[PDB]
Ligand binder design. Sequence first.
Ligand code: ZN
Ligand code: ZN
Ligand code: ZN
Ligand code: ZN
Lengths: 1114, 67, 48, 166, 45
Amino acid sequence: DEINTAQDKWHLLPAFLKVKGLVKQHLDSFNYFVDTDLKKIIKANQLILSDVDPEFYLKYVDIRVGKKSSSSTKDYLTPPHECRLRDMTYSAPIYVDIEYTRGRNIIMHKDVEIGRMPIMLRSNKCILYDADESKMAKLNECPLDPGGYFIVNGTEKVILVQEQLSKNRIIVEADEKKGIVQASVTSSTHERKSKTYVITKNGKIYLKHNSIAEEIPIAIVLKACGILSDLEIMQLVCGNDSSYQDIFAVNLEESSKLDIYTQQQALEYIGAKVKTMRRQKLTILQEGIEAIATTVIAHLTVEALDFREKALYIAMMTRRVVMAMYNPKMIDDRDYVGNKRLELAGQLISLLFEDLFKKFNNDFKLSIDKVLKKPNRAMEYDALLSINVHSNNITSGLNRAISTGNWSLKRFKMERAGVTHVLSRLSYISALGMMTRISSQFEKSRKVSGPRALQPSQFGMLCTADTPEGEACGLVKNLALMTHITTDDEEEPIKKLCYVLGVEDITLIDSASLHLNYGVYLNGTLIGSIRFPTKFVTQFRHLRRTGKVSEFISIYSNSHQMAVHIATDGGRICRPLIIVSDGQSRVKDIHLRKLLDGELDFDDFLKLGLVEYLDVNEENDSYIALYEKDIVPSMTHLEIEPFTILGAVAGLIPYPHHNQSPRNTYQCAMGKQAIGAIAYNQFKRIDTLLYLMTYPQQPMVKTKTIELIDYDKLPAGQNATVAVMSYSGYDIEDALVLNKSSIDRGFGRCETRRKTTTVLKRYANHTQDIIGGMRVDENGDPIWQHQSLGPDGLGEVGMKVQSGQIYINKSVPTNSADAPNPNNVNVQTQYREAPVIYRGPEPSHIDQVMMSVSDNDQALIKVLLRQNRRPELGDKFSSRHGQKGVCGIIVKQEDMPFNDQGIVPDIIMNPHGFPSRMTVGKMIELISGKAGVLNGTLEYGTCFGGSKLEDMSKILVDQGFNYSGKDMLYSGITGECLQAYIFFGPIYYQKLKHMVLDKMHARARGPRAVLTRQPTEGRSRDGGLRLGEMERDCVIAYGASQLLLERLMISSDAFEVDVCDKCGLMGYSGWCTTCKSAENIIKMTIPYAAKLLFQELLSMNIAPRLRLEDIFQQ
Amino acid sequence: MIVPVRCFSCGKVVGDKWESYLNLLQEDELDEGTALSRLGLKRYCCRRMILTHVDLIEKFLRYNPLE
Amino acid sequence: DATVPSGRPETYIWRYLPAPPVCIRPSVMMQDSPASNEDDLTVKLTEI
Amino acid sequence: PVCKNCHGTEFERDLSNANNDLVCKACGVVSEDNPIVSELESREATLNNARRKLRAVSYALHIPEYITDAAFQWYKLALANNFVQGRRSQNVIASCLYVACRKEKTHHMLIDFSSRLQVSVYSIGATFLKMVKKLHITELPLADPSLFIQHFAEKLDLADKKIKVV
Amino acid sequence: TLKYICAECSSKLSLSRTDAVRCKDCGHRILLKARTKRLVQFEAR
RNA sequence: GUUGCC
Ligand SMILES: [Zn+2]
Ligand SMILES: [Zn+2]
Ligand SMILES: [Zn+2]
Ligand SMILES: [Zn+2]
């Protein structure tokens, strides 16, 4: 046990995931919401007032979610698994305390109910926080559940981590045919979403905004900000001894065109042409409305008197618009990761809580003055008794806000739809892969494949081998394994702190030398104008390494421009790295030996100064190092572990650094659809459609990723014997042949579970729904449809069902909408039958049947169906490296090859894949695959390393097998040897979805749609295929002129029309009904889609007059 | 779930050798490779049936409806 | 042109408008409630 | 409903062959194949206001909603009998809702309605008697006090053994 | 007979019809049907 | 009617 820091840095990676798990972004935002973020909202909407009767006031002192202040018990709560099968919402009520004027005096009241918030699992306000599988065994929830998801009224959902372009900063834009702009979108935290634009029309800098009635040029809006001398304008933007004077000097004479020349006259040029939003008072001064028009603009900065720091913020924004016109190399892209802001769950539902909470205490205010407009009702009235009527507006707002994923905001007036999804419980890692994914914004750049592509500034930030394809090929991305999202800290202390480190203020320095010097940008604003930054920025890190400042700060310092940047805004991506000070790192393995003793976790390493976080910007100044055997004396930031670039759902690929790069993405889309196990309580839950698998196996070659998320403890798929060779012609491309015997021994017996549910509804006239059943005939109750009804009407558990044979007998009254006649005369026999039939092509069983009651008292019926099946041909097998396969044929046991010891290979692949697909990883999976179970030890095939090949061949040859795994075989058909040898052994094969019996479909003569009488789309809608438009183009090139007519009129849509000759439009059975003579009627046949055109086109005032000839006598 | 009653590839029985393989681990602390060779899984395809078998049944039964 | 009864150019603006037969606008019942959710096209003709 | 040759009255929808046809058991002639599945203003205003008022107090009293829509039928026909004119709107809905509380036989007793409007109990029961005579409610269940016990115990903050105490 | 059982109380209660939905011997509100005694047939493959 | 996926 002689440890070193050479290869044992890996043993701190699990210490990072032990205290700081896999759902880091979802829970740590909601835990920031419930504790701290609610007090900051009641303090911003307190003291509702009534202008009538002015001595009445309701103000909020605090707010709490969960436990009371009287009893001080932990909580009284329904467990979530008891809640997720009754279609209820897992909620705990919100309690506030309030004080107000009842009357003679003011009183305070404690613990008022106002609403019921939903709480995500594994957040600290639930029961499941800090349980030790003993309380959790009582609550029948799996210990290995990831958590972090709402279960709102039944089906369980989760909101995604959405992101947008970086607000409150600037970009640049370059366009050829239109002129060039630069965006600067900003957002004050109340009711404003304002974005500014600077345009170069025909060689002149301009400025427009969505609150000004038209364009206002640039020399005005800087003389209105105080800078008036008109040499300082050129001195800010251009500098000295350049070509910028030749481009910019056109703008200066428009000051001479408008004859302004001073700071007084500059303002009212704007307010003469401001677009007037009416405030309905409108005492506009013609001097005061311009100062606010130079205040509600570029909402990064606000001003007291001097306008000065806002002035040169515009001047730095117009410097980069003339730097781009000099050469178009200065352009930035709006898909660089530094211009992206991930923002997480709890600080995103906080916006929806505003528009409900202000809608609470205004209709509650409107209920107050409606009572207080009474003369007698003024003395002893209490207002608290009408708070329960407005209470549930918060609840029913929030519940549909998670159910239907669309959010109707008001302070921004914004309509983000698709904000949540239903999580996939198809596999285990499918329930964790969707927990770490990123949804983009779709701003209609479908032509631009820029953000469709993948940028190199992504190594370890978020995963690179995982992305879906098809409908979104580059717009769905996934977090890396070691990944933390920042959060905002503060900004006024560091502005006081940088002054201490030797920087001055902007209000002292002239612009004669700020272009000579550098400049600090705090969130994009110039505040210090420092020189010699390399003394300055290295003293800033050394405070951060000791931890006087918060560690989520970046000191990006570029040199293409003469500026340095600071960032403290929070909501941006970062990873940690270990500090390397000089030609020796700060690894210090005596620290690393003290970690495995266990007294100091990962959190103590960033306290002492051995690790700090790096975002995407701070990667650009640093010079990070791969391995300790590659240290340069000018080399920092050694890599903590190199295989941390793949997320938790791509990590199960063995040796991904050998195979081709596209054949990892094709497995990430299909690992998440693998049949396997779900949870420890998986036979207890009642969900919609789950696949379960009988005899699973843990995979043979593991990875260091899959032992972090316990994939081995409930895996998916078996590891059968694969002998890659062609056989019997049934494997031409990526087909695969498996025996009749081994599936009979239990190879991949899957199992299908299905929910069905009904609700017993109580109508207006007080009539119930009843579960009577079992009609009889001829000494016998059980009819062929009634062998499984049971005595109670609920079809009894344990026996099989077929087509027909209802299993929940349901009867509804016939007077569902009649007025209640207040008597008792005729209610004895009014139930018309409506059972639920089991369709399906194969007889199944019913697994268990339960009944209970919902939120409001209605009886529930939920019975769970069950069927298993043997893997016959057609089904879709996989190989965990992206080699799909339909089962070609099932042959008997004697026909396969057989080795010296009698091993029959289970599944045979043809060799026509490995040259094209370049999947060398499977060829290295098998050499490490054969050697492990012969030595009896599982083997580690990781990413970017793993079990080497040269020491793996030696353990194979010590037993007697071949050195390259390539053993010989005999032929099971004819008895002798094979002229060549066969590559041989076990490969891990997981079964996949898309089995064939729920895709076999056929429709002879079925339903027709009500409007156009064609066959109806949808398998459950009993199908019928769409013969499309280029398929109409495919027939016509064959010259065929008869089956084209029958397949578009006769077999599909035939219809019989009698039409008139003169004034030729349609008529019914025996008339013309426009010349009421009924004589000239000639019968033909046309499609129903041609009749219906000839009527709705006649509904507007155009007439399809038909004219008719006879066929004969040509 | 529980150990399968037969090998997938050859066709002999493994239903008496599962709890005996555990009995070669708490007492007589031994290498897992040479343990089954003492137990008698001579062939290749029988070794994989008990090395990779997750025993999921010792977690299902704690969720019983009968306390 | 002339020689048809409708050929005069006064008919190109509305004075009478026809109502389409109700097979074009079927009264679909969504079967969530015993009230029929009528399609978009009736209430446009109803309000005029 | 009647066949064309043997005039049978029973038709059995066979659904095994994706045709969903209609045919009798007697002779075997189909009936129809190719099935066709379907894929005053102030009078309306014064009850739309009355809808929200029933929607109002049902929220505060934790009424399950299948009484609220049933209670709307009582107010709708009592609107026709000229009972609402003159009397208080905030009073007449309270008596209207309480009738549907006792047809359903819930735990909700009358004075809980009188509490939040901060009026006397005997005012609300006065118009309850003057209503129930006018529109002739004859059948009406008795207020069994056995209902009230098992609803009291939840808010009575008693021990875990809450089933033996009732 | 052997009628409905509770979720965790596991107490055999036969509810009379249109009366209640709860169980006795516990305040719980989920009932599951106990499995029938009628003979059921299976293949062995 | 609207989304998700192959
Ligand atoms: Zn005609
Ligand atoms: Zn074997
Ligand atoms: Zn007949
Ligand atoms: Zn119980």
